Write an enzyme that holds these catalytic residues in place. Structure first.
Site, PDB file in Angstrom:
ATOM      1  N   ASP B  13      73.301  29.459  30.430  1.00  0.00           N
ATOM      2  CA  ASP B  13      74.523  30.142  30.131  1.00  0.00           C
ATOM      3  C   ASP B  13      75.358  29.504  29.037  1.00  0.00           C
ATOM      4  OD1 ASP B  13      75.331  27.975  31.651  1.00  0.00           O
ATOM      5  OD2 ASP B  13      76.804  29.234  32.806  1.00  0.00           O
ATOM      6  N   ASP B  18      73.817  23.032  28.374  1.00  0.00           N
ATOM      7  CA  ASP B  18      72.688  23.980  28.371  1.00  0.00           C
ATOM      8  C   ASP B  18      71.891  23.770  27.102  1.00  0.00           C
ATOM      9  OD1 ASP B  18      73.160  26.404  30.592  1.00  0.00           O
ATOM     10  OD2 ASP B  18      75.052  25.537  29.803  1.00  0.00           O
ATOM     11  N   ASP B  43      79.161  30.721  31.442  1.00  0.00           N
ATOM     12  CA  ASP B  43      79.947  29.604  30.919  1.00  0.00           C
ATOM     13  C   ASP B  43      79.966  29.629  29.393  1.00  0.00           C
ATOM     14  OD1 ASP B  43      81.636  27.385  31.307  1.00  0.00           O
ATOM     15  OD2 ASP B  43      79.968  26.063  31.670  1.00  0.00           O
ATOM     16  N   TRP B  86      86.534  26.893  28.986  1.00  0.00           N
ATOM     17  CA  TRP B  86      85.191  26.354  28.971  1.00  0.00           C
ATOM     18  C   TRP B  86      84.182  27.234  28.217  1.00  0.00           C
ATOM     19  CZ3 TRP B  86      84.374  25.024  34.889  1.00  0.00           C
ATOM     20  CH2 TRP B  86      85.326  24.055  35.258  1.00  0.00           C
ATOM     21  N   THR B 140      69.731  27.037  34.138  1.00  0.00           N
ATOM     22  CA  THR B 140      70.864  26.133  33.990  1.00  0.00           C
ATOM     23  C   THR B 140      72.204  26.896  33.989  1.00  0.00           C
ATOM     24  OG1 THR B 140      70.674  26.128  31.613  1.00  0.00           O
ATOM     25  CG2 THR B 140      69.415  24.469  32.835  1.00  0.00           C
ATOM     26  N   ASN B 189      77.954  27.178  39.218  1.00  0.00           N
ATOM     27  CA  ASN B 189      76.815  28.076  38.990  1.00  0.00           C
ATOM     28  C   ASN B 189      76.495  28.945  40.235  1.00  0.00           C
ATOM     29  OD1 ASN B 189      76.366  27.140  36.301  1.00  0.00           O
ATOM     30  ND2 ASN B 189      74.626  25.862  36.890  1.00  0.00           N
ATOM     31  N   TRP B 263      74.850  17.603  33.182  1.00  0.00           N
ATOM     32  CA  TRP B 263      74.327  18.406  34.269  1.00  0.00           C
ATOM     33  C   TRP B 263      72.980  19.035  33.955  1.00  0.00           C
ATOM     34  CZ3 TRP B 263      79.440  19.769  32.509  1.00  0.00           C
ATOM     35  CH2 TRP B 263      80.495  19.469  33.364  1.00  0.00           C
ATOM     36  N   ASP B 264      72.969  19.944  32.996  1.00  0.00           N
ATOM     37  CA  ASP B 264      71.799  20.736  32.703  1.00  0.00           C
ATOM     38  C   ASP B 264      70.745  19.918  31.983  1.00  0.00           C
ATOM     39  OD1 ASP B 264      73.288  22.807  33.805  1.00  0.00           O
ATOM     40  OD2 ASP B 264      73.810  23.758  31.902  1.00  0.00           O
TER      41      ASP B 264
HETATM   42  O1  LIG Z   1      78.578  23.293  37.428  1.00  0.00           O
HETATM   43  C1  LIG Z   1      77.990  22.706  36.246  1.00  0.00           C
HETATM   44  C2  LIG Z   1      77.453  23.797  35.309  1.00  0.00           C
HETATM   45  C3  LIG Z   1      76.400  23.216  34.369  1.00  0.00           C
HETATM   46  O2  LIG Z   1      75.305  24.150  34.206  1.00  0.00           O
HETATM   47  C4  LIG Z   1      77.112  23.036  33.012  1.00  0.00           C
HETATM   48  O3  LIG Z   1      76.544  23.918  32.044  1.00  0.00           O
HETATM   49  C5  LIG Z   1      78.534  23.419  33.206  1.00  0.00           C
HETATM   50  N1  LIG Z   1      78.480  24.345  34.356  1.00  0.00           N
HETATM   51  C6  LIG Z   1      79.793  24.813  34.892  1.00  0.00           C
HETATM   52  C7  LIG Z   1      80.892  23.756  34.879  1.00  0.00           C
HETATM   53  C8  LIG Z   1      81.295  23.059  36.010  1.00  0.00           C
HETATM   54  S1  LIG Z   1      82.549  21.921  35.669  1.00  0.00           S
HETATM   55  C9  LIG Z   1      82.617  22.324  34.037  1.00  0.00           C
HETATM   56  C10 LIG Z   1      83.473  21.825  32.948  1.00  0.00           C
HETATM   57  O4  LIG Z   1      84.302  20.951  33.174  1.00  0.00           O
HETATM   58  N2  LIG Z   1      83.291  22.335  31.702  1.00  0.00           N
HETATM   59  C11 LIG Z   1      82.402  23.327  31.454  1.00  0.00           C
HETATM   60  N3  LIG Z   1      81.617  23.801  32.412  1.00  0.00           N
HETATM   61  C12 LIG Z   1      81.689  23.359  33.673  1.00  0.00           C
HETATM   62 CA   LIG Z   2      74.950  25.812  32.292  1.00  0.00          CA
END
Ligand SMILES: OC[C@@H]1[C@@H](O)[C@@H](O)CN1Cc1csc2c(O)ncnc12
Ligand SMILES: [Ca+2]
Ligand SMILES: OC[C@@H]1[C@@H](O)[C@@H](O)CN1Cc1csc2c(O)ncnc12
Ligand SMILES: [Ca+2]
Ligand code: NI
Ligand code: NI
Ligand code: NI
Ligand code: NI
Ligand code: NI
Ligand code: NI
Ligand code: NI
Ligand code: NI
Ligand code: NI
Ligand code: NI
Ligand code: NI
Lengths: 318, 327
Positions: B13, B18, B43, B86, B140, B189, B263-264
């Site tokens: 996403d 990612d 995202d 984000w 992801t 996610n 993370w990803d």
């Molecule tokens: O939950 C982690 C997932 C991963 O797949 C990342 O791509 C961000 N995504 C969402 C996310 C959670 S906190 C956070 C953040 O702080 N900034 C951008 N995205 C996120």
């Molecule tokens: Ca992601």
């Protein structure tokens, strides 16, 4: 009449535009001799602003042999602090790959201790007073360092200033300080320390050229333009400014336009205006309304094309 | 017995991590044959995520002759949308200089229209079902695309999946969804579409390896490390990842320990080096309620997923730096 570089000091507060301004200045040694930088803990965390200023200096020195120069952290403190969200941008830049090239990091670590011993306000006073030629001071942060110098040294300082080219204020347009306790009429650099602004802007001993929101509202940083730096990605300065601008794609090219004036004085016309800087604690704190005896020369109708041509040329230097 | 490459699809996403994940996969053709990417409007704004995916593909193809591949925008829609702040990150990346090199922009514009005609969900189903070899899907973003494929095609789809390596959930730690209407136990996610997660995570016909916050909490993106990319700035992939990370290093301080994590990237690293973490079989009971615990992945039993545990920081580090020296 060309072949003598202006002697310049950049007095900045370390956000992305402050650094684009520093690149414009330092990448044009024919027109600018940058003899010093001051960094203020305003739109940045000063330690990050300090490191990034250092590494940019070192990078240009390596690539085009622009001289090294002293850098000092100001100890000025906010009347009204910037939002923390904004202040982290110099941290991000400190971590960027283009600002961690191993030769630059090695030179900065060697130079950093001598520069760490400087007080920024005193450095600004000393560079200006010792300079052979009169100095152009480019102020892209709050006006606290200039105000301190004027108060401490008076004529001994101000007689050595050619002009002070300032990013700040909003005269005939709205401001950008939007807080529950403010009315939206003020601009952030003034709002950070209004009394300092009031002391410098209407100081009768100094020529101020003011880039207020009136002019800067005309140069937003836009994707269509920023994408242009890809064609120039081989140049380190295009990697630097392209990235700074891409992290921002509004965000305006505020401080960069201010430095552009020093490079190309025809970029904008100037209007003499008397200003009455609001230093109250009301909702209009930091406003710079028309007052009379002129305080400043306000930039009007900056040329977008001239600006654009200057940014793209300068970022092809290395 | 070790000399072959896994067929992989990245279902993402479009946030910064990612794309680091995508770079890790695509820069290692000896280990990975990337036959497709899906992008979801979660995202990211999908059009940006689409374009960045494209330009990264083209850049690699230019530099190291990894194959081109189809890319499709999913039409999945949020149950719970991501914060807008984000989702802009892929717009920033789209305007970066390392993603506007003229040869790469030219190739992408030529390839874009064919790819624009794809539906992301359908492409995921088609790529998996036509593939000669069973496919590893690296997910992801949210699980909406996998869920759609499972529901539309069942075993015609799932019999072709080798395994599904997923970033999502929080099992024995807190989550990261902090809203006035939530309790903090959920991970984003899952939260984006909980019924889709419930369908895929406890689908009895598929092997899911889950990188939940338990493991990802272990790899914050930190200045001291990210600075390392400067020594490698001559490599385009170091410019790319160094910048993506350097845009992210402040979050740990700004948000009082709530870092931007890799993370990803760690999720994709598992596909490159399966020994990077140990796996624990766990049965999960995905919360699809509209309460404050919506999106939680608590322990339920008959195992749903193999949860990654104690990932190797050093292995990850070594893999990221080597991959970013590829070009
Ligand atoms: O939950 C982690 C997932 C991963 O797949 C990342 O791509 C961000 N995504 C969402 C996310 C959670 S906190 C956070 C953040 O702080 N900034 C951008 N995205 C996120
Ligand atoms: Ca992601
Ligand atoms: O008011 C403009 C001055 C310029 O010197 C810029 O460095 C930002 N600075 C403060 C500022 C105003 S809006 C804004 C923003 O949106 N992000 C970061 N800084 C700012
Ligand atoms: Ca500034
Ligand atoms: Ni001359
Ligand atoms: Ni030297
Ligand atoms: Ni000194
Ligand atoms: Ni107030
Ligand atoms: Ni142009
Ligand atoms: Ni083998
Ligand atoms: Ni080709
Ligand atoms: Ni197709
Ligand atoms: Ni908006
Ligand atoms: Ni060190
Ligand atoms: Ni804090």
């Amino acid at each position: 009449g060309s072949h003598m570089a202006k002697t310049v000091i950049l007095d900045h507060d370390g956000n992305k535009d402050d650094f684009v301004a520093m690149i414009l200045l330092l990448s044009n040694p024919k027109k600018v001799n940058l003899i010093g930088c001051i960094c203020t803990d305003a739109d940045c965390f000063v330690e990050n602003g300090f490191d990034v200023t250092g590494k940019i200096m070192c990078a240009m020195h390596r690539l085009i042999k622009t001289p090294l120069f002293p850098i000092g952290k100001s100890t000025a403190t906010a009347v009204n602090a910037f939002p923390t969200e904004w202040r982290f941008s110099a941290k991000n830049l400190d971590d960027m790959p283009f600002l961690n090239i191993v030769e630059d990091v090695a030179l900065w670590e060697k130079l950093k201790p001598e520069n760490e011993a400087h007080n920024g306000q005193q450095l600004l006073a000393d560079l200006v007073m010792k300079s052979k030629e009169k100095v152009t001071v480019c102020v892209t942060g709050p006006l606290s360092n200039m105000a301190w110098c004027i108060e401490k040294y008076g004529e001994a300082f101000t007689s050595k200033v050619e002009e002070c080219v300032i990013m700040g204020g909003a005269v005939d347009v709205g401001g950008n300080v939007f807080l529950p306790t403010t009315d939206g009429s003020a601009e952030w650099n003034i709002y950070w320390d209004p009394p300092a602004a009031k002391k410098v802007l209407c100081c009768p001993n100094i020529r101020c050229v003011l880039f207020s929101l009136d002019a800067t509202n005309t140069v937003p940083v836009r994707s269509v333009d920023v994408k242009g730096f890809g064609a120039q990605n081989q140049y380190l300065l295009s990697q630097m400014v392209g990235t700074m601008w891409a992290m921002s794609t509004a965000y305006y090219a505020w401080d960069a336009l201010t430095a552009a004036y020093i490079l190309e004085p025809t970029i904008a016309t100037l209007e003499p205006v008397a200003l009455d800087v609001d230093v109250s604690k009301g909702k209009s704190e930091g406003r710079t309304p028309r007052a009379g005896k002129p305080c400043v020369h306000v930039a009007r109708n900056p040329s977008k094309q001239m600006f654009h041509d200057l940014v793209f040329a300068s970022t092809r230097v290395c």
